[PDB]
DNA sequence: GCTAATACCGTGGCCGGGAGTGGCACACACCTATATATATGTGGCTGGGCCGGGCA
DNA sequence: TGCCCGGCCCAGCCACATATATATAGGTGTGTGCCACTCCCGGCCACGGTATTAGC
């Protein structure tokens, strides 16, 4: 019983930066008449570019052979993209290029203990696994 | 039993609880098969080596190893108790030679590492402490 | 120079028979349980003594 | 500042393995062989496609 609710609704698609997007996982957009920005809550303001002006054949639907409950939302109205104290963001972007992994740990003991635990050590059982 | 025989022929020392820890042979039938196998070998015609192995299990210096060697030989010459299997003589010998120095392991750690009873190493440490007189090398 | 006809080869599914596998029977071999001295050992309970903590 | 209660540790003690013989006996497990059931393999039957030769 799929039913189109309206589709008359106009939605704008946004390609956000990763820290603010993962933070969204509220602000106030200021539309300047051909340049629009965004005043977030304390914090930065963001210019959003008119990425694609004409954006037809693109729509938005939601879901509530196996038919399921399908509802239609609205048409896509404009393709957009948020563009960006920027030195701290640039330093964080330089800082993300410092990921490393831990190296192999060298056991420093007297060897004879570990080598005793290798072969026969007069210690059996102590763990239930495939014991039937 | 063939592995144990090949161990006794090559002057190597492996305790029954070691091969028993490797293979579950139920001990008794292992002893009978080892006995009749020894009879087969006789028909087709030494605890000192255990000391460096357990000293390797504990990570002890060479002076404690040769000290437990002289202690093992002397204790083999003094008689009294004679042995009660050589494993306990080895562990109480290393126990005395390590209580002579300052490297601390106590009785619980050496009893859970070498799989020996604490009451047995203390029972042997009593009479061993009684024979402490003639066991000094230097 | 152009047209028409005939034969042979290869795959897939099903059924039957054999074979294998499982079960049953029989025989043989193991494998338990009890007493005796010996020692010596090891692991788990029993009783007594000592130590630690809290409240008025 | 003093008194009472509970828990833990140490010293110890009992039971079961190791080795010796022997009888009892009576049980259990394992192996082999045969026969029956299931699975696999082989055999049979059906259907479709491609190439070559001869005559007027």
UniProtKB/Swiss-Prot annotation, chain A:
Alphabetical UniProt keywords: DNA-binding, Nucleotide-binding, Nucleus, Phosphoprotein, Transcription, Transcription regulation
GO BP term, pick one: transcriptional start site selection at RNA polymerase II promoter
Superkingdom field: Eukaryota
GO molecular function: DNA binding; nucleotide binding; RNA polymerase II complex binding
A single Gene Ontology CC term: nucleus
Subcellular location: Nucleus
Stated family: Belongs to the TFIIF beta subunit family.
Function field: TFIIF is a general transcription initiation factor that binds to RNA polymerase II. Its functions include the recruitment of RNA polymerase II to the promoter bound DNA-TBP-TFIIB complex, decreasing the affinity of RNA polymerase II for non-specific DNA, allowing for the subsequent recruitment of TFIIE and TFIIH, and facilitating RNA polymerase II elongation.
Miscellaneous notes: Present with 520 molecules/cell in log phase SD medium.
Subunit annotation: TFIIF is composed of three different subunits: TFG1/RAP74, TFG2/RAP30 and TAF14.
Protein known as: Transcription initiation factor IIF subunit beta
Species this chain originates from: Saccharomyces cerevisiae (strain ATCC 204508 / S288c)
Encoding gene (name): TFG2
Residues of the whole record sequence present: 58 to 280 of 400
Curated annotation (Swiss-Prot), chain B:
Compartmental location: Nucleus
Transmembrane segments: none
Renumbered ranges of Sequence repeats: 54-130
Function per UniProt: General factor that plays a major role in the activation of eukaryotic genes transcribed by RNA polymerase II.
UniProt similarity note: Belongs to the TFIIB family.
Something else known: Present with 6750 molecules/cell in log phase SD medium.
Subunit structure: Associates with TFIID-IIA (DA complex) to form TFIID-IIA-IIB (DAB-complex) which is then recognized by polymerase II.
Name this protein carries in UniProt: Transcription initiation factor IIB
GN (gene name): SUA7
């Amino acid at each position: 019983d799929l039913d189109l609710e309206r589709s008359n609704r106009q939605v704008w698609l946004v390609r956000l930066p990763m820290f603010l997007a993962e933070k969204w996982r509220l602000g106030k957009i200021r539309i300047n008449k051909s340049k629009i920005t965004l005043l977030l809550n304390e914090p930065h303001e963001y210019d959003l570019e008119l990425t694609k002006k004409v954006v037809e054949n693109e729509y938005v639907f939601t879901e509530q052979t196996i038919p399921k409950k399908t509802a239609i939302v609205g048409t896509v109205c404009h393709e957009c993209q948020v563009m960006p104290y920027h030195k701290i963001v640039e330093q964080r972007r330089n800082i993300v290029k410092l990921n490393n992994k831990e190296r192999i740990t060298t056991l420093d003991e007297t060897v004879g203990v570990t080598m005793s635990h290798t072969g026969m050590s007069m210690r059996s059982d102590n763990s239930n696994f495939l014991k039937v | 039993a063939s592995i144990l025989i090949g161990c006794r022929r090559a002057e190597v020392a492996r305790t029954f609880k070691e091969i028993q820890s490797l293979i579950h042979v139920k001990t008794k039938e292992f002893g009978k098969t080892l006995n009749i196998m020894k009879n087969i070998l006789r028909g087709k015609s030494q605890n000192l080596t255990y000391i460096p192995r357990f000293c390797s299990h504990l990570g002890l210096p060479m002076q404690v190893t040769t000290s437990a060697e002289y202690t093992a030989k002397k204790c083999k010459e003094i008689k009294e108790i004679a042995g009660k299997s050589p494993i306990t003589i080895a562990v109480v010998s290393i126990y005395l030679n390590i209580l002579l120095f300052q490297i601390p392991i106590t009785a619980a750690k050496v009893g859970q590492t070498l799989q020996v009873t604490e009451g047995t190493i203390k029972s042997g440490y009593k009479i061993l402490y009684e024979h402490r007189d003639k066991l000094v090398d230097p």
